[PDB]
Design a protein around this ligand. Sequence first.
Ligand SMILES: *SC(Nc1cc(C(F)(F)F)cc(C(F)(F)F)c1)C(C#N)C(N)=O
Length: 559
Amino acid sequence: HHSYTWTGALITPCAAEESKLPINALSNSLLRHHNMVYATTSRSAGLRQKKVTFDRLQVLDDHYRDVLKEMKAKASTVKAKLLSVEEACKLTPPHSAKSKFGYGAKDVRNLSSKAVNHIHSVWKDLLEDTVTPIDTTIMAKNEVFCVQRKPARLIVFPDLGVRVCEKMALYDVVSTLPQVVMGSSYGFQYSPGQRVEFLVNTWKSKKNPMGFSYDTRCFDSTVTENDIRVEESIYQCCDLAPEARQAIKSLTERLYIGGPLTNSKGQNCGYRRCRASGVLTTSCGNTLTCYLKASAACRAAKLQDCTMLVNGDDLVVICESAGVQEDAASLRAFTEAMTRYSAPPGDPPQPEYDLELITSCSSNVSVAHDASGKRVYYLTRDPTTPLARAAWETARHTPVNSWLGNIIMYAPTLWARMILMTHFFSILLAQEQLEKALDCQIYGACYSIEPLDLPQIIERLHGLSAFSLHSYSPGEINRVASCLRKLGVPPLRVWRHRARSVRARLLSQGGRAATCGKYLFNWAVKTKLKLTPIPAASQLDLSGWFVAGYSGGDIYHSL
Ligand SMILES: *SC(Nc1cc(C(F)(F)F)cc(C(F)(F)F)c1)C(C#N)C(N)=O
C-alpha cells in the first residue's frame, strides 16, 4: 500500500535550472536581500521522494459510507456532456508540454491533422483498452520561495494526446459536479470577495463561532486506490453518454489509480499508486475526497453545525463552539478520524475564535475601510511568497506571471496596490508594454490578460471599493512592514512616493493607460478623485473565471 516505489533512476530536469535569484538593473528597487529568494530544482527531488513515499492504511466506517451515499445522490442529478476534439483542443494552453508523438500544444490549438488524428487514435484506444497502464512523466517543479529551503515538489502527467482526451471526457464533469455535490462548500466557485463573504456569513451563522484549518500531510500521497475508485463511482453517477462512461472508467483504471513514472530522459523511475498531480481530475478529485473524509470526520468527532470550505486539499471548518475544552477534544477526534481515513495532519490543527486568525489557501480574512469609512472585509495573505516571485519575474521572463495573478486576486490588499502595482506598472511603462497580453493563472487555469484591463477586471471582481480602501488593520499593516524588512524591500512610504510618479506617467499616456493611473493609484495622491464605474467593465466576459479549480489540469481560458 505504498504511495510510490522507485527503481533508483534520478528525477532528471528537461533543461537548465536556476536556483539563485537572477539579478538585473531593476532588482534592487524591489528587493535587496537576494539570498533569501530561491527556486527549487531537481537537485532536491530525492528529498521530496522520501517525504511523499509511505504506506497508507485505511479504515472506512459507517460515517464515511453515509456521506458518500449522500454525495452520490447529489451527483446523480448532474448531466455532463462529451467535449468534441476541437473544443478540448481550444482548452489546451498555447505553451503546454509537447507530445512525444510529433506535435505540440500549438499544433493542437490549430487543429492540425497530425494532432487531431493522434488524439482520435488515443481516444479509440481508451475505449477499447481499460487495463494497460498509461505512461507518465515525472518532473521536479521549479518554484520560487523565501528561505525559512524546501525540496522541489513533484509533478506527474500523461502525454499531451492523453490530456486532450481527459478534457473531452471529464472537463464538463470536473467543471460542474463539485458545486452540485458540495454546494456552497466548494471553494472554487467563489471569487476572493465571495470567499470572504461566505466565510464571514458562516462565522455569523454560529451563536458561538469556532473554526480551524486542516492541513493534510502531502495530501496527494495520502490518496489511495480506494479513494480514486470512489471518485470514479461518483463521476459515474452523473447522466453521461455511454462513450464518456467508458473513457472515464478507462482513464481511472489506466491513469488515475496509478502508473509507471518516466523521467525526462526516458528512464523508468518507478511506479505511482496515489494521486497524480498533473491530471485534469487532480483538483476535483482532491476536493471531493477531502470533503468526503472531512464531512465523515465531523460526524465521527461529533462537531455541531459543521460548515466547511474546501479547495482541493485545503480545508476550512467553522462550527458551533462548545468551550475551549470540548473544542480541543472534538478537534483531536476529528484529526483521529481523518487519520483513519488516510489523511493525517502535517501540522496539528488548532481551534480559532478569531476569523481573521484562520489561514486557508494561504489566505486570511481582514478588515479595512472604504470611502464612506465603512468597515469592509477583504481577502489578503502573507506577501512573502508573492514578493519573492515578483523579484524573480523582475529579472526573468516566466510562463506564468504570478505578479499579475496576485494583483487580480489581491487587488484590495495593501501590498498588492502599493508594491506590486507600482513596481510592475513602472516596468511596463519603461518598456512600453502596457497593452501586451501576459499569461497568469487563477485557480490553476491559465489566462491571457492585458495589464491595461486591470481597472475593469478589478472593478468587476472586487468592486470600486478596491480602488479606495484605507485604514488597514494594525495586524495586516505590521505583517507587511515586517515582510519588507525581511526581504530588504523599501518601506511603503517609498512606494507611495514612486506611485505618484508612476501615476502621473500613466495619466500622461492618456486613454487606457490614463484609466490605470487614475483608478489603480488614486491612493497615492493626497486629493483623491471620484472614481466612477468603467463602461468597458461590463463588456468583460469573466464567466468561467471563478467556477472550478484546475490545478495541474492543463487548462487554458482565452480571454
Ligand atoms: S488552496 C488553493 N487555491 C487558492 C490559492 C491562493 C494562493 F494565495 F495560495 F495563491 C488563494 C486562493 C483564494 F484567493 F483564497 F481563493 C485560493 C488550491 C489548493 N489546494 C488550488 N489548487 O488553487
